[PDB]
From a paper:
The 20S proteasome, which is composed of layered α and β heptameric rings, is the core complex of the eukaryotic proteasome involved in proteolysis. The α7 subunit is a component of the α ring, and it self-assembles into a homo-tetradecamer consisting of two layers of α7 heptameric rings. Interestingly, the human α7 subunit, one of seven heterogeneous α subunits, self-assembles exclusively into a homo-tetradecamer with a double heptameric ring structure, while the α1–α6 subunits are under equilibrium between the monomeric and dimeric forms in vitro.
Author numbering:
A (entry chain A), B (entry chain A), C (entry chain A), D (entry chain A), E (entry chain A), F (entry chain A): 2 to 245
The structure:
């Protein structure tokens, strides 16, 4: 509890140098499950630790993945409603950005403006800043496969392999173990689902379901969801890992 | 009472990661009675636990169901006045959305914008956020039977069977028991009124009245209220359940 | 005193789920006297417990009834000045609503917009929300006799017989006793003044004067005040009740 | 051909004192058929000389009568398209005028503003002034049966019996013969259809069809079209006249 | 050549009563080929006399039919570029009109506003009025099969069978011969293509191609083009007529 | 010289039906040289009859081809300055249109809005309408190879092979001779340069230079100019034709 009076409406700084809304949003991220994203050599594919709680839900729904453009997706974590509001405002802002650019969409300045809108609600006191994270990734030809992760603190870090959520530590160690630039996207995403559901603890956390969505060379550049054969294949691949 | 100074105007985060307005609105929902909604295979029909208190009321009035379009309804719970304000603003926004679309109304982006307006009043300090919930459901042909539940935290979750209100736990277990995709809407809605008024405790809660409203194939796609023969039929069906 | 820090500017929620401005406005209503309204089968007539305090007042003045349209009246309770401001803003809004509609005025969406303006000042912090209540009632032919009661919490409940003010409990029991749909308006309003001035306690409360105003079939659809013969007749009728 | 250079864009006056656009619009009116309107003692009913040309038309369509409000109609003559534009703009202006007034709609200032909009397009040079005429008539209780005829020159003349169109001379003589204030509306409108289709010359003009629409006491104040029994009855009544 | 100085910028009237822009636009319509539209009992189907001139054209292109909504089409004649501008502005205005209405689109006030925009450019002098015609037709269930023809003079006439273009006289006689309300749409549209390409003179006019597009019961309410089997079937049907 | 007083500022119509600005712009087009465009099966490639007059010019400059997007070009004819203004305004409008659309750019509604801006300056009198023509063509994968020709009269006609300029007659006959849909783009564009410089008369017209620019499959979808080897190859191919 660092801060007495500082952390009330902490747009005002404390002499540690820690804006306590950033700790709000980060701890809210580590309250939610661990979703990662990776920038392989001919695609950018995301993955979400989706949590099964009951039978009243809907499969295919409860989706923490969100299309932004034809090949731009949004792998959210944190709080879902503000992330969907960010998805809508980023939809209109990606409309403005493929206005601005002539070719297919160059994710750099796109994610810069999206992170600008993220950090713009972080120095006032009307409502809260966005206590959620999300990952933007685009695959192209004239500019290639790009991946950028907008933190809740507005400092958008790009990655060849990223990790947000609860168990970010083991996830980022295992991402820094893998060959994030070398192999093709398909084996690497099998390894992604494999190792992330190794990281899934089945006792402290409840039941789980695979959540993943393509974009790359074999999917004709479309931001496709992972199909049911490849979904069950990655499920069996993670089960081969978890049986050991 | 998690939060000392955090939960004053809790647009500012606390280091747990829990925006305390969301707990305001959720506990306000569990203070009100339990209303559910279900997405059957040829319709989307809602249901409200309506509470009888006195004879000064009006039957047909005290309606916690609200038409939004010709086949779009709003099954509210929480606080009624802000829910009716949301009904009016969603009426103009559904006007803007059936402006935007060419066919009959595609509830997805509709409920996205409605949940955006829900979460937009959740980071300021002029007045409160909406301490109420509501369910949007549309039945169509070119896009089908769609159901979406906008939480008070702005993360609109769609469902094949949903549940909000006080006794959400037993209600969502019984919804995850039923065949929410398999049987026709009529037997399923009989089972809905049946099991929800099983869940109605007559001692801790006061007297009750059935509240339900159609839209589906037999109702010519009109968002009709359940008629008095089908109302008394579902009453007798729930009484057949409650006699056991 | 539920709420420590919550109830300062309680647009922010407390984890009970009770927006404390609603308790401000409701307790302010139960501080003021008990005024009721009833929707009989060929009219909508209001009634106010008017309190005699001194001889410096003016009879015909101190009116807690307010015309809104030619057949739309406003039976206020709570605080009078904000209720008159609501009367003025509802005058311009009823102007906008009989702009919008072609026939005589359909009170439903009218009272919806009025209750929207009521609840719109309930989530900010510049000045207070409206700590007062009022009843809207319209009698027509193409749409009939309609009655709607806008609470201070913005959830406008319609009634066939309503009751607001201090002694709402005994008043609403006696309204749920009477035949609010069956007899003609004239005998029912005699019973209204009768039973409401039975409910008037002459010891704890000070002296009283009858306040009532017609609209119905015999008054040519005009929102007339109750005339002096019918006023003294209802006074004598309540005295016949109170002599027992 | 009075005017050499004057009548080019005759917003500029000629020293006769005749704005030649008024002669454009009047001669355009006398090019179209003769439609009259009459203000009887408990209604205001219009009538149009409708011209049958071929079988490709639609009966009930080709309507030169236009509803403006629930009891306000528009009996047009001249050019039909600008008259329908005047019908639309008068629809929004009647919306603004039943905004302004509290009771049912007082046609006087309504037709004043409509004639103001008529004459407002008569001193410029972008497009033409309205080369058409129309009759406004309202029947009420608090203000009664009112009839007003807006000329194309903007000087709205009210009438107890009016006449516009081609054979205005014989029509206005026969209107000044009849009892426009004395008898009930039904016999008078039978006499209207009678004498106007006496005035219809079947050789110089082509085939004809009766066009008439009620508003009055028997029609519950609704601006109804004349029903088929009363239509064929007035046809037979005019045939009884024309057989002589 | 009626009018010396009048017909220069003929927003100013001449004392005949004939706005010479209406003669511009009508003679421009009779310069273009004859396209008709008909309102059969379960659909509204259009037809265009398309003129084959060379092999450099594109079949399926040179389309004088234009979709406005999912079941609203635009059968143009006159000048094509201003008709496509009217198609675009009517696209945004139909967006505004299915904003305004709750059910499927009621063509009446739609075509009223479109004809208002037609006549609005007819009294100024910046550029020309629209020297082209078009036909709007909608098929529905709650409001049915509606057909409306907006003339270039802004007086939108609805029809059960219409005809615009060059040989309007023989076309409208043959439309007033046929059973425009009685038979099903399919045989009637075969008769439409039959008789209209009887009316096509192959000597004075050059080569022709069938142009027709459905909307009705068998086409699932979609404004479909006539398929190639039904196109060649109607070609052979017109050839069976023309062989006699 | 059809029209006495009509053709002064001919936004006003003449009773022939010929807006004389369209004849201004068309005769201005036939004053300039003949440029064609063709929609082959895997590309849309343009071609301009460029006229050599002196040595003071610049090769690569005097370009009557204009890039609009990465694969959208503009083959102009008529007057060059207004065509470059149309190129700039179409650049911003194509920015607005690839705002609006999600995939690569769908030329249909693009050219519709561009032709709307063309025809929008054709009914006023401040400055002239655009006395020039231009051809828009886009090659894609999700929507394909599209070609559209915006006339100066605003009626944008799409083509599989088009022709504008001076000798449009022989050019369009030879385009309707060729296989505009069958062969690959490369041989067809060789035939284009071949036959168009057959059509070039070297006596009445002065010296000429080849002007052509690709977009298609071999050019990686880039709107490339024809390279110097393929330029001189098409020159030699046209010389092989012209030697006969």
């Amino acid at each position: 509890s660092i801060g007495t009076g500082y952390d009330l409406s902490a747009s005002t700084f404390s002499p540690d140098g820690r804006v306590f809304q950033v700790e709000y949003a980060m701890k809210a991220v580590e309250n939610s499950s661990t979703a990662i994203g990776i920038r392989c050599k001919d695609g950018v594919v995301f993955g979400v630790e989706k949590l099964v709680l009951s039978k009243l839900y809907e499969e295919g729904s409860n989706k923490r993945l969100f299309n932004v453009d034809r090949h731009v997706g949004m792998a959210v974590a944190g709080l879902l409603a503000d992330a969907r509001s960010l998805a809508d405002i980023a939809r209109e802002e990606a409309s403005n950005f493929r206005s601005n650019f002539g070719y297919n969409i160059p994710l750099k300045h796109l994610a810069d403006r999206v992170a600008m809108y993220v950090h713009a609600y972080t120095l006032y006191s009307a409502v809260r800043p966005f206590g959620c994270s999300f990952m933007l990734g685009s695959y192209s030809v004239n500019d290639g496969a790009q991946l950028y992760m907008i933190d809740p603190s507005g400092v958008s870090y790009g990655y060849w392999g990223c990790a947000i959520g609860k168990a970010r530590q083991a996830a980022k160690t295992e991402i820094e173990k893998l060959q994030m630039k070398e192999m093709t996207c398909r084996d690497i995403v099998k390894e992604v689902a494999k190792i992330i559901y190794i990281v899934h603890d089945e006792v402290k956390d409840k039941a789980f379901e695979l959540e993943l969505s393509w974009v790359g060379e074999l999917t004709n550049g479309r931001h496709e969801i992972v199909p049911k054969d490849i979904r069950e294949e990655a499920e069996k691949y993670a089960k081969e890992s978890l049986k050991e």
